[PDB]
Amino acid sequence: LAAGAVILRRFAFNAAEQLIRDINDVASQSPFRQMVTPGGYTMSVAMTNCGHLGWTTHRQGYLYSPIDPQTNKPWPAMPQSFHNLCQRAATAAGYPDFQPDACLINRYAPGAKLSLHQDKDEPDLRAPIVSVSLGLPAIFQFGGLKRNDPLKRLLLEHGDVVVWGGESRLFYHGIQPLKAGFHPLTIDCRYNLTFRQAG
Numbered sequence: 001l002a003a004g005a006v007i008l009r010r011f012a013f014n015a016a017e018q019l020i021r022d023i024n025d026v027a028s029q030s031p032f033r034q035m036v037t038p039g040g041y042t043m044s045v046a047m048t049n050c051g052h053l054g055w056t057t058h059r060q061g062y063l064y065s066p067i068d069p070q071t072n073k074p075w076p077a078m079p080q081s082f083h084n085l086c087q088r089a090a091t092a093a094g095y096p097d098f099q100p101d102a103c104l105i106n107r108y109a110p111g112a113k114l115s116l117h118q119d120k121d122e123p124d125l126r127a128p129i130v131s132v133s134l135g136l137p138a139i140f141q142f143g144g145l146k147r148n149d150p151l152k153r154l155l156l157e158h159g160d161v162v163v164w165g166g167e168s169r170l171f172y173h174g175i176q177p178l179k180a181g182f183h184p185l186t187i188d189c190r191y192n193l194t195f196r197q198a199g
């Protein structure tokens with residue numbers, strides 16, 4: 001249960017293969033990299049971005065940049081497959097006007113994890129975030145408006161799309177260590193795309 005959240009399991013099943021081809025295309029321009037947090041610690045999840053803006057870590061904290069700090073070049077353009085799926089999911093969830101200008105791409109290797117955090121780097125917290133999972137299943141955990149609220153667990157599997165809007169948009173959340181396994185399309189990892197209106 002998550003007020004404001006719209007869970008569309010297997011919604012992206014049909015576009016999965018194409019999405020994976022485009023993730024590889026994006027990674028060819030802006031390679032996956034394990035960003036270092038302001039405290040000086042390497043994240044276990046590997047990331048990259050496509051679209052006008054990209055989420056990244058900085059010395060002063062977190063922020064969106066139109067330039068890839070590693071390549072010093074713009075992030076790859078938002079592929080059509082990405083925009084089309086996000087549009088259908090957003091509209092289906094009730095957000096037909098949602099127009100993302102950034103897509104953070106996370107890659108989870110076996111054991112990779114993402115500790116509890118809030119996504120508050122966006123200008124308007126009223127705009128939802130569309131999440132698309134691919135490959136191996138992962139346990140998504142979330143709490144409440146506070147970092148010490150009751151944590152709930154939700155398994156996200158290949159093709160699962162969740163539109164995080166309303167109150168859920170501000171919930172603390174994370175991903176538990178990815179259990180080892182095999183998937184025909186991603187082999188041994190999980191991918192997650194999150195579309196955001198960062199501009």
Ligand SMILES: O=C(O)CCC(=O)C(=O)O
Nearest residue numbers: 106119131140175192194
């Ligand atoms: O991988 C996930 O399902 C969570 C992605 C996320 O919330 C983020 O990276 O900010």
Ligand SMILES: [Fe+2]
Nearest residue numbers: 117118119173
């Ligand atoms: Fe997040």
